[PDB]
Amino acid sequence: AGNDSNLIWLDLEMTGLEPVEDVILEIAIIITDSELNILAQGPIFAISQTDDVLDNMNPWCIEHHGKSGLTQRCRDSEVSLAHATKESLAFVQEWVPQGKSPMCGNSIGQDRRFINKYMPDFEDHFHYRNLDVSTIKELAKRWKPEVLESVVKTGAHLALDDIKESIAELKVYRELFFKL
Amino acid sequence: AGNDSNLIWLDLEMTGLEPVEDVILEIAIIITDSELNILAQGPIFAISQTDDVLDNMNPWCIEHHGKSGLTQRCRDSEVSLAHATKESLAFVQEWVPQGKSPMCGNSIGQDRRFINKYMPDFEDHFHYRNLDVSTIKELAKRWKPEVLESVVKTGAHLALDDIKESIAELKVYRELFFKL
Ligand SMILES: [Mg+2]
Ligand SMILES: [Mg+2]
């Protein structure tokens, strides 16, 4: 329930990877408890974007985010970045108290960068720490390389599945890589 | 030796934590192999700083970095940021090839932020991933909370010890938290 040591998982899609001139296009939040049971599903926002930014997005993402259906959802969305922030932060505020959960996902150091610039209010609620599953992957690769084979290969259309299968991935690290 | 899957550990001290107006004051690099045996000790640089920045550093760090001896070493250093970059990057280039090792340390997402802005050439050599021991700490705290008690309490005058005791810390996660 909404107390104790629950976790905020999130994933993001951007234009490219340099945040001082690149922008958030999508965000999703998933809250689990400490044992990786999904406890809640936050809002999924496609953030309004200038038609100019979206057409001259850095390519391949042009290819990928046109392919996703995501790009037009930003053309057709009136969700500012503020509103996304305001309701993202409200969402989390009812599942764990300020400053207790880390930011959990895959390669999450790079998401914070954009979170810290564009969604300052949303970041103030997270523990200063990250919990990156991709950090564990590579201890795995260097120590017990065989457990990597029980990770499921792919599939991640929406950001939710990107979150969900990074939660699944941890659970096979939990049972096959950690003492108890 | 200088091949295979060796690791670049580093730690940093800054003025404060907002990089677009805060600056690197110190850097150290330690290379280990994949089993946490220290393989090499890189240069330790105290980066030249304007007397203006250093006096109006964000306080407490004023207290701490005056206390450290670090602050005057920056006043007395002619090491630009470029030189630090140039020889940091040369150092690493002889222990692991470009794009293979992650950036390893404690709460390292926040160091990259400064690395990516101020030392771009040094970052191009790291795997895009971080390996953060502080990520493991909190899986520990949430799953087998008892193993935290074999972590050694503190002591970290220089950046080296900050690196070294984050390498020590992993080794007690290795033996008491991970299957094998
Ligand atoms: Mg992602
Ligand atoms: Mg540090």
Residue numbers in the entry:
A (entry chain A), B (entry chain A): 2 to 181
Quote the passages of the study that discuss this structure, keeping the authors' original sentences.
The overall structure of CpsORN was similar to other reported exoribonucleases of the DEDD superfamily. CpsORN has a characteristic core sequence, comprising four invariant acidic amino acids (Asp12, Glu14, Asp112, and Asp163). It should be noted that the unliganded and two separated uridine-bound CpsORN structures contain one metal ion and these structures do not have enough space for second metal binding. The crystals of unliganded CpsORN were obtained from 15% (w/v) PEG 3350 and 0.1 M magnesium formate (MCSG I #G10). Matthews coefficient calculations predicted that one molecule is present in the asymmetric unit, with a Matthew coefficient of 2.45 Å3 Da−1 and 49.79% solvent content. The final model had a Rcryst of 23.51% and a Rfree of 29.69%, with a total of 180 amino acid residues and 30 water molecules.
Among these, ORN belongs to the DEDD superfamily, comprising 3′-5′ exonucleases that require a divalent cation for activity. Our research group have focused on the mechanism of action of oligoribonuclease (CpsORN) from the psychrophilic gram-negative bacterium Colwellia psychrerythraea strain 34H, to understand how the enzyme hydrolyses small nucleic acids. Structural analysis results show that CpsORN is a stable dimer and its active site is formed by swapping residues from the other subunit.
